[PDB]
Ligand binder design. Structure first.
Ligand SMILES: [Zn+2]
Ligand SMILES: [Zn+2]
Ligand SMILES: [Zn+2]
Lengths: 212, 690, 330, 65, 640, 43
RNA sequence: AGUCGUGCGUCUAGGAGAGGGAACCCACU
């Protein structure tokens, strides 16, 4: 590596690069399987090679990464490309005489250990558009309704009527959830895997209770 | 000084032009695409070659589309006409070079040796999962392949086990890279060599830094400079040249810059070049002679080997360097080649010693070739070969650059040798001769076929060589009247030619036109080349009659040459002559196309025209006046013209030629068995046609 | 900065220009060389760890490239001659005829005696291996800082004015924000991170936006820093519109115009945004002031401000602990 | 130096569209907000991440090394 | 359109032009350039004579003389990497060229490679284009000289005294040469006796005279023997009897002296050094009075009346302050303060080192009873001065006032910019006197109100505003000649009793003379300065209340640019000279890169104003606010 | 073992040898990165 | 409308540690 950037900087940038994880369940954590180091059964190996030329700067993208390990017919670890041009995520720029040559090992993991594993960027969660449950006391100076614009989801619920009294028996319901995926996993598979993980955690709790 | 630094920087830039833009443009093309143009861009982008260029940028913008179109047409021609041997490679790691991907692949040494893949060869790669291992892979599969990708060979590294590592450069944005997975079999087949295209592109880019850039853009030759007549006469007497030739040489040498010399065939063009070289040497100054074809370079080298006389009359033989391969160059020129001259001049501890010895030998060879080039005074080569890497590394300025057959080469090829700081350029060419080789008719429509010498002649009239010796005055009459618009004077030997015989007899005359009353030509779909049997039969009968008349009195070894516009017709004639006459046709008779036969002169020339059917008014290549001039000017004593009367009469030039022949009584009706009185059918047909 | 061998250099990972920039900044060229980043600040007391002007920074943002820094430290060594014909030598000590040997590991040193770039050095590891002949020689290596460590970035060797060999070794380290690190807005507010929360725990707006920073509101009244809230509102308006906002002192624009523009952008006029508790999803009773704001990571960091001594070296003059954490003082 | 790979606030990948952002600003001569909206950035976190970024990598590459 | 009014926003464009013409480090670069151009030659010429002679001094490009090597061009990056000194050698011709040393070269000066370098050239040299230079590379370390604040010289400052002290009011002037051979001459005149003390006497502490002498004896020595002439010089308006009543004790006590020789003898009585008062001491006292007493006004005996007139003016100011008709002078005002940049500091260091070298070569010549210039004496001295910050004549000096040179801070670009434009106050960081620490109202537009360190240094270290520049100095002789030719009566011919109305003209604190038509002269001077004939840095102030004209050309004066407003307009309302056409021209020039800040100065659209001049002008807040939804901040009404 | 700041060409000089670049007069003489394996993590 | 010039290269596998005072400047609570 001889780029103007730093090895730690480029490594951090590479870590955030999304990778295909449709068959992540098939892949096993490195800490679990008995392997010396980053065996093909628990890791994905890619190689990044690049260098500049006379007067044209070399831009390094996600597509430049080349898978070197054997995936055994699994569509996992492929860089995610979504831009119209198809270049991918810009990584760095190399000038004439600047040689970049490195290897990347990707392991199975969760976003809790590091945000780079986050499959969803923003997860919007809303409920009770109209202030029916009195959960929030809108801050107002002249008029609460005028100051605070109506939410988009408000159209999906009947507007409140001042005639009726406050419903103290009402509880939170009809939660509007918008899930956006970075690209590693489709939103449908994202929610499916989240439900599966929660169910597996509850089942593990039950198993621990039974064992103890 | 500052000027020296600027000159050095300009030379370095000219000799170190990056090829990356050319690779980017070429690799974006689709091999499977079958169209007149590489892309679907609007036709309006292409523009005809402007006579005057405002600035180098406009010249480059005009030329680059034409060069790309020519390259695409050459690629298509290689794909269709030629079928290179396919091979297979294993994909490796990919390196993201600037706007490119370099893929390392391992191949067998025998496979690449058989295919003939070098470091400057273009290939097309494809993925064929359903391809049967036993199936005979061919270029047809690549053309019909769903996915194809162009690649350029960069390096070829040999390694134990007979393993060749090849670095293939492809366009980054190309989607085919998605199939370039590790340990993946990819079927690749060669297309063509990009060395000439790369050199042309480099010259086009560097034209800005050329010393004569202004003259090239303006295309205006430097004004003539008056010279004393006494000096011209002295030079003519010393070199034994002609008055007109001596005056033209003196005028060209006196003025600095581009010099135009129009030498019609048979006017001592090689003699004129020798005189120019001798005059320049008499007045170290390295001189670079460049010719479009290796044959011209070999002829020039052979002529120079005999020595060139100076003003004092003392013949001398300056060291001559031929920059070319031994196989392509003539056998006689092998000694003059750089490799042979260097060889003549030269005359795990074991592994390390062997490697050190090999490195020492390589260094000694490099030093020897550098010394030979530095001491050499005359360097003869081709336009493409003039840009050889060795010369660029040497970086030796060539003050005088002579270009031969300036009308037979493209502008880029002619300008290629000028990169080496060419201050004086002397271009010799005859516009009436064959135009520069072009693969695309569309490019010709944009005046791409037009060479720089054509524009220079249009701007100013060159010094036409009026005196000719080999060409018979009758033969040169019609070309002089029409093609050259006069200004041609027959030499002293108007009728004192050594080949006196076979002229007195009435049937055989210096010029004749034996038309065919009836003739049908068949066109082959595979080759699209017309073939006619009447022409072949007439030619065979005439040759047999000539041999019978002088079977033993005179030997026709290398004196009879049959030329036809179409390759298929010439091949059929050769086959028929071999079947009938036998092996004697190998030497006695020479069969070759008119374009290919250019540069060769024979006592008897049989120009056979294939166009016989009158159904289609189209004339074809026969319409062009330059081809007719080339065909007529290659003869010395006897010309036998064969072709249907009406089809030729359709064209204006051919109609004028027929009228002139009738005026000179050179027209004689001919048909099958013309000289066979036994066949009464031929006599009856001739009588009826009268 | 790659070629500059400064004694101490700090480089921000992802410099960002402020959303609200004074018209004089372009003349100062601050936009070309910004010092800070635009982080989504919520002025609320969420977990109680931002009290006393403290702040809560998102752990996910921290590990995703938020306020990461590169610290470069350069050590210089010379072969200054003490007496003619006697000079120091840059060579790896071999323990032979040497009496002064320190805990620094000399294995990292190469044959030349200088660690090449890409070598891990920590603690008292020797960076430059120099030995002064004595009349056989005594070690004079330059040990690495005890309290600082990292990957050696570059090494250069030249000749001084008198021709003596001179060496300069620059070591680069990556420093990530921590709780003890000090940050500050552009209004004289200085805060030390109290706790690092992942994107899940921190509250999220109705659009799913999780703030990068949370600041206790109590910092505003006492400090009289009304400009911070106006800057946050202007930054929100600029981000929504996409056009950089003018935050010059005496600009004709007023707070009412900014609020009107924000309302036109489909948000609360005064910048308050409904937020949800990340622990349980319950809507917060009181709406939270929210929006982007420019922040700067000050050089004051806990990593270099933490010291501890247990029977360390003592001054010869008084047999008492020496002064300075870098020298293992007390 | 280079555009951040993912948004600090939410984590959305924004490095792909930096070149597209520059092309829209230059080729189409579109305003900042319109270009960002076309690229598909709704939340203002990504909007300020892209808008506020500075291309110091080019300036560093201006040097010979 | 072209002459239409100008909006507030368009003014920003003009501001941009300023930063293009000068930049953020303009002051230091200009000071260093003017130093190396003129001050070095002036110092060489001042001590050129010896009992040998130096004709000219030449400065080459920076170079390094490596041992066992060949000298070659040295660049700032190479110096920083190799810890070399970025200095250029000095060549001086000697007659009956010699390398005298190396002068450090400031970045972005007129003697550095990066000056005539484009962005591509700077990158090729591994130099950041954003770097503003303005520092010295010593042993690789980057050192910046902080502007030093000092009390302006050649000005009379009158201060009261505490009740316990017998003195009531003291008027002090720090006379010093503005051309060469600078030496501090603090002349103080004190009024002994508090209110009601019944002893209203005034005594001036002549330099080298410990015992204060009455002003009457000084006037007698100068040549004004008659008491009436002394009173007329002291008091201009005979109508004011209070001044005469207060001065009556002074003349009563000075009546003893009536002869010039007696006055000179009495002056020479104190400070005896084994001399005879009547033998070769009257000449000594006369020489002291010619040089020591008010050296700045003149240094020749041809016209000694100027000293008498200046002393009379000083006594008049002291009496006015004592009578309470004139407010006490304030030290915090920048009009009386000068900010010496790297220019004057390097000039002093040079002067000292060159004097030391001259002494050394003189000693060497004396030894050689029957070349050999120690160049290191200057180079090493300068290196030490720029290394530890000890600004002293020699290393052994303990009162060098360290802190002048500080390691440039490069934590961030803004920090470097602030440090390069930083100012320091020589007052010790200790003490608990809040008055100097507080920023005076004069700091408006010259010192940033907010940017300042917190703690002991608070209120002492100051940072100049964006549109603030330090005068580099100019020759006042053209101004003196113009004033004399325009109708300024010589001070020798001044006749106050027959000239009740007259405006005194002061140039660099020198009372050259008086003028009868102050308005016309002031208008002509302003027109010439706006046209560009006179350097804009010169500050001209006219006070009608005191009827005094002051002209300042000395360096170290802080000034800022402001638009000029004139009543000439078709509409008739007050409008600025700058119009839409000038802004359009500036925008066109910016787009092209013809019309820059220099053109604005030449056309008179923008004028430089210093601290002193601001006391005699009214400034509008905005271009169009003071000339002609309760959300906008309340704006002060345009009463004027 | 060493490279030039400007030429960026390998020198591989030894002890008791000049530290100046052979190609040019510049003598910065930077050193290339260590051949030892180096690993980094995105954390 | 049916044909064509141009280029490439030849030797490669063996055990242990211990130390700077003064002055100046910047900066933090
Ligand atoms: Zn494993
Ligand atoms: Zn985001
Ligand atoms: Zn070099």
């Amino acid at each position: 590596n001889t780029t103007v950037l730093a090895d730690e900087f480029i490594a951090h940038r590479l870590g955030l690069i999304p990778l295909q994880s449709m068959d992540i369940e098939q892949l096993e954590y490195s800490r679990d399987c008995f392997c010396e180091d980053h065996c093909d059964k628990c890791s994905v190996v890619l190689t990044l090679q690049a260098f500049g030329e006379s007067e044209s700067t070399t831009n390094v993208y996600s597509k430049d990464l080349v898978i070197v390990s054997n995936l055994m017919g699994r569509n996992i670890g492929h860089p995610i490309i979504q831009d119209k041009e198809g270049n991918g995520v810009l990584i760095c720029k190399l000038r004439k005489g600047q040689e970049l040559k490195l290897t990347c090992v990707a392991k199975k993991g969760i976003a809790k250990e590091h945000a780079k594993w986050g499959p969803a960027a923003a997860i919007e969660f809303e409920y009770d558009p109209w202030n029916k449950l009195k959960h929030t006391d809108y801050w107002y100076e002249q008029d609460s309704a005028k100051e605070w614009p109506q939410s988009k989801n408000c159209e999906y619920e009947d507007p409140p009527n001042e005639g009726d009294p406050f419903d103290y028996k009402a509880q939170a319901d009809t939660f509007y959830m918008n899930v956006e995926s970075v690209g590693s996993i489709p939103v449908d598979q994202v929610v499916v895997r989240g439900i599966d993980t929660l169910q597996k955690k509850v089942a593990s709790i039950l198993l621990a209770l039974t064992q103890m | 000084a500052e000027l020296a630094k600027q000159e050095l920087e300009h030379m370095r830039k000219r000799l170190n032009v990056d090829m990356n833009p050319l690779y980017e443009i070429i690799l974006q093309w689709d091999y499977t695409r079958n169209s007149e143009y590489p892309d679907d861009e609007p036709i309006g982008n292409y523009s005809d070659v402007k006579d005057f260029f405002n600035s180098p940028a406009d010249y480059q913008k005009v030329m680059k589309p034409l060069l790309l179109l020519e390259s695409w047409q050459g690629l298509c021609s290689s794909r269709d006409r030629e079928d290179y041997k396919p091979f297979s490679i294993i994909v490796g790691n990919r390196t993201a070079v600037s706007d490119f991907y370099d893929v390392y692949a391992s191949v067998a040494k025998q496979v690449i040796q058989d295919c003939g893949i070098s470091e400057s060869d273009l290939i097309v790669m494809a993925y064929l999962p359903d391809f049967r291992p036993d199936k005979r892979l061919s270029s047809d599969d690549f053309k019909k392949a769903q996915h194809t990708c162009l690649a350029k060979v960069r390096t070829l590294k040999n390694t134990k086990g007979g393993n060749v590592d090849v670095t293939l450069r492809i366009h980054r944005n190309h989607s085919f890279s998605k199939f370039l997975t590790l340990r993946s079999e990819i079927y690749c087949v060669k297309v063509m060599q990009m060395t000439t295209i790369e050199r042309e592109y480099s010259t086009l880019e560097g034209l800005e830094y050329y010393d004569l850039v202004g003259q090239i853009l303006q295309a205006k030759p430097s004004p003539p400079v008056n010279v004393d007549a006494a000096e011209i006469e002295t030079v003519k007497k010393s070199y034994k040249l002609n008055t007109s030739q001596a005056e033209a040489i003196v005028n060209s040498v006196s003025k600095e810059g581009f010099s135009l010399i129009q030498g019609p065939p048979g006017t001592g063009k090689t003699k004129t070049i020798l005189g120019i070289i001798g005059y320049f040497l008499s007045t170290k100054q390295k001189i670079l002679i460049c010719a479009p074809s290796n044959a011209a370079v070999d002829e020039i080298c052979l002529r120079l080997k005999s020595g060139v006389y100076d003003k004092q009359g003392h013949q001398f033989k300056p060291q001559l360097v031929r920059v070319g391969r031994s196989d392509v160059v003539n056998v006689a020129i092998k000694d003059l080649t750089l490799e042979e001259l260097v060889d003549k001049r030269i005359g795990d501890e074991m592994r390390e010693k062997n490697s050190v010895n090999y490195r020492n030998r390589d260094l000694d060879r490099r030093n020897a070739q550098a010394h030979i080039l530095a001491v050499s005074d005359i360097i003869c080569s081709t336009l493409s070969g003039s840009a050889h890497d060795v010369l660029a590394t040497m970086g030796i300025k060539f003050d005088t650059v002579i270009i031969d057959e300036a009308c037979q080469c493209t502008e880029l090829s002619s300008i290629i040798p000028l990169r080496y700081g060419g201050k004086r350029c002397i271009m010799v060419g005859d516009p009436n001769q064959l135009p520069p080789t072009v693969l695309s008719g569309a490019a010709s429509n944009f005046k791409y076929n037009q060479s720089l010498f054509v524009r220079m002649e249009k701007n100013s009239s060159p010094y036409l060589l009026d005196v000719q010796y080999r060409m018979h005055p009758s033969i040169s009459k019609f070309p002089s009247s029409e093609f050259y618009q006069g200004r041609l004077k027959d030499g002293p030997g108007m009728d004192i030619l050594n080949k006196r015989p076979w002229h007195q007899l009435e049937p055989l005359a210096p010029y004749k036109f034996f038309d065919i009353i009836s003739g049908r030509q068949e066109q082959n779909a595979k080759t699209m080349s017309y073939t006619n049997m009447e022409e072949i039969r007439v030619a065979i009968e005439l040759v047999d009659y000539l041999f019978r008349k002088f079977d033993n009195k005179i030997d026709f070894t290398g004196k009879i040459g049959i030329i036809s516009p179409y390759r298929e017709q010439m091949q059929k004639m050769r086959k028929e002559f071999a079947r009938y006459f036998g092996g004697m046709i190998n030497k006695s008779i020479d069969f070759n196309t008119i374009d290919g036969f250019q540069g060769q002169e024979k006592e008897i020339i049989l120009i056979s025209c294939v166009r016989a059917d009158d159904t289609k008014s189209s004339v074809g290549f026969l319409k062009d006046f330059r081809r007719m001039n080339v065909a007529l000017t290659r003869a010395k004593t006897s010309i036998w013209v064969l072709g249907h009367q009406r089809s030729l009469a359709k064209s204006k030039l051919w109609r004028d030629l027929i009228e002139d022949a009738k005026d000179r009584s050179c027209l004689a009706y001919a048909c099958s068995g013309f000289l066979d009185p036994r066949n009464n059918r031929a006599q009856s047909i001739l009588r009826k046609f009268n | 900065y790659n070629v500059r061998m400064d004694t101490m250099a700090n480089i921000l990972y992802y410099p960002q220009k402020p959303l609200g920039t004074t018209r004089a900044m372009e003349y100062l060229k601050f936009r070309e060389l910004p010092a800070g980043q635009n982080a989504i600040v919520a002025i609320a007391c969420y977990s109680g760890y931002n009290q006393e002007d403290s702040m809560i920074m998102n752990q996910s943002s921290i590990d995703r490239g938020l306020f990461r820094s590169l610290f470069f430290r350069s050590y210089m060594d010379q072969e200054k001659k003490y007496g003619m014909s006697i000079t120091e030598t840059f060579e790896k000590p071999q323990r032979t005829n040497t009496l002064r040997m320190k805990h620094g590991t000399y294995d990292k040193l190469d044959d030349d005696g200088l660690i090449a770039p890409g070598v891990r050095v920590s603690g008292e590891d020797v960076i430059i291996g120099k030995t002064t002949p004595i009349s056989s020689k005594r070690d004079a290596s330059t040990p690495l800082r005890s309290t600082e460590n990292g990957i050696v970035d570059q090494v250069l060797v030249t000749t001084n004015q008198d021709g003596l060999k001179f060496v300069k070794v620059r070591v680069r380290t990556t420093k990530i924000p921590q709780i003890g690190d000090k940050f500050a807005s552009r209004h004289g507010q200085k805060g030390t991170i109290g706790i690092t929360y992942r994107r899940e725990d921190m509250p999220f707006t109705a659009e799913g936006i999780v703030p990068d920073l949370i600041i206790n509101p109590h910092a505003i009244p006492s400090r009289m820093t009304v400009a911070h809230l106006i800057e946050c509102l202007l930054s929100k308006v600029a981000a929504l519109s996409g056009n950089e906002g003018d935050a010059s002192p005496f600009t004709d624009i007023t707070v009412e115009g900014i609020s009107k523009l924000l309302r036109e952008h489909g948000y609360q006029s005064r910048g308050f945004e409904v937020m949800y508790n990340g622990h349980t999803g319950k809507k917060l009773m009181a709406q939270i002031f929210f929006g982007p704001t420019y922040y700067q990571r000050l050089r004051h960091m806990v990593d270099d401000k933490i010291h501890a001594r247990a029977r360390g070296p003592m001054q010869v003059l008084t047999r008492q602990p020496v002064e300075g954490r870098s020298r293992d003082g007390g | 130096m280079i555009v951040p790979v993912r948004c600090f606030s939410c984590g959305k990948v924004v490095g792909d569209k930096w070149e597209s952002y520059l092309n829209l600003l230059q080729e189409d001569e579109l305003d900042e907000g319109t270009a960002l909206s076309r690229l598909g950035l709704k939340r203002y976190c990504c909007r300020r991440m892209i808008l506020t970024h500075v291309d110091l990598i080019e300036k560093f590459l201006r040097y010979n090394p | 359109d072209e002459s239409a009014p100008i909006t507030a926003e368009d003014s920003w464009a003009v501001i941009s032009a300023f930063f293009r013409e000068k930049g953020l480090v303009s002051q230091q670069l200009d000071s260093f350039n003017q130093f190396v151009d003129y001050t070095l030659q002036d110092i060489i010429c001042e001590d050129s004579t010896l009992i040998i002679s130096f004709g000219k001094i030449y400065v080459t490009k920076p170079m390094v003389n490596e041992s066992d090597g060949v000298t070659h061009a040295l660049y700032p990056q190479e110096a920083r990497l190799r810890n070399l000194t970025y200095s250029s050698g000095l060549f001086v011709d000697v007659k009956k060229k010699v390398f005298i040393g190396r002068l450090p070269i400031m970045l972005r000066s007129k003697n550095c490679y990066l000056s005539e370098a484009t962005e591509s050239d700077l990158y090729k040299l591994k130099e950041c284009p954003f770097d503003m230079g303005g520092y010295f590379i010593i042993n690789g370390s980057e050192k910046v000289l902080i502007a030093q604040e000092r009390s302006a010289g050649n000005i009379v400052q009158v201060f009261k005294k505490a009740a316990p002290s017998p003195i009531s009011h003291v008027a002090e002037i720090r006379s010093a040469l503005e051309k060469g051979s600078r030496f501090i001459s603090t002349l103080q005149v004190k009024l002994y006796g508090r209110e009601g003390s019944s002893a209203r006497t005034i005594k001036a502490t002549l330099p080298y005279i410990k015992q204060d002498i009455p002003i009457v004896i000084i006037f007698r020595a100068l040549g004004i023997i008659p008491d009436g002439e002394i009173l007329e010089h002291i008091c201009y308006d005979v109508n004011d009897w209070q001044m005469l009543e207060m001065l009556k004790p002074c003349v009563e006590d000075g009546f003893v002296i009536q002869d010039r020789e007696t006055a000179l003898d009495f002056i020479g009585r104190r400070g005896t050094a084994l001399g005879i008062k009547k033998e070769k001491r009257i000449q000594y006292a006369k020489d002291i009075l010619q040089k020591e007493f008010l050296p700045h006004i003149t240094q020749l005996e041809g016209f000694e009346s100027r000293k008498a007139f200046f002393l009379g003016y000083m006594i008049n100011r002291l009496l006015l302050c004592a009578l309470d008709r004139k407010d006490q002078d304030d030290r915090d005002h920048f009009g009386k303060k000068r900010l010496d940049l790297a220019g004057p500091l390097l000039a002093q260091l040079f002067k000292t080192l060159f004097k030391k070298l001259t002494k050394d070569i003189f000693r060497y010549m004396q030894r050689t009873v029957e070349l050999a210039i120690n160049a290191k004496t200057i180079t090493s001295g300068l290196k030490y001065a720029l290394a530890t910050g000890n600004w002293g004549e020699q290393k052994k000096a303990m009162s060098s006032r360290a802190g002048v040179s500080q390691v440039l801070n490069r934590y961030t670009y803004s920090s470097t910019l602030s440090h390069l434009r930083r100012t320091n106050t020589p007052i010790g960081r200790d003490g608990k006197l809040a008055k100097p620490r507080q920023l005076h109202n004069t700091h408006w537009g010259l010192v940033c109100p907010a940017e300042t360190p917190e703690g002991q240094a608070c209120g002492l270290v100051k940072n100049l505003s964006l549109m603030s520049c330090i005068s580099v100095g100019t020759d006042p002789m053209p101004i003196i000649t113009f004033l004399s030719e325009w109708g300024m009566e010589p001070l020798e011919d001044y006749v106050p009793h027959q000239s009740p109305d007259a405006t005194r003209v002061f140039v660099n604190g020198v009372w050259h003379g008086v003028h009868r038509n102050p308005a016309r002269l002031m208008e002509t001077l302003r027109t010439l300065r706006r046209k560009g004939d006179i350097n804009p840095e010169v500050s001209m102030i006219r006070d009608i209340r005191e009827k005094e004209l002051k002209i300042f050309t000395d360096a170290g004066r802080v000034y800022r640019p402001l638009f000029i407003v004139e009543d000439d307009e078709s509409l008739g309302h007050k409008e600025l000279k700058v119009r839409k056409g000038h802004i359009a021209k500036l925008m066109a020039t910016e787009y092209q890169d013809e019309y820059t800040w220099s053109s604005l100065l030449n056309e008179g659209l923008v004028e430089y104003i210093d601290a002193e001049e601001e006391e005699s002008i009214l400034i509008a807040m905005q271009p169009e606010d003071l000339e002609p939804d309760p959300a906008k901040r309340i704006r002060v009404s345009h009463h004027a | 073992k060493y490279i030039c700041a400007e030429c960026s060409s390998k020198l591989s000089l030894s002890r008791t040898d000049a530290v100046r670049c052979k190609d040019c007069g510049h003598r910065i003489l930077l050193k290339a990165r260590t051949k030892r394996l180096v690993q980094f993590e995105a954390r």
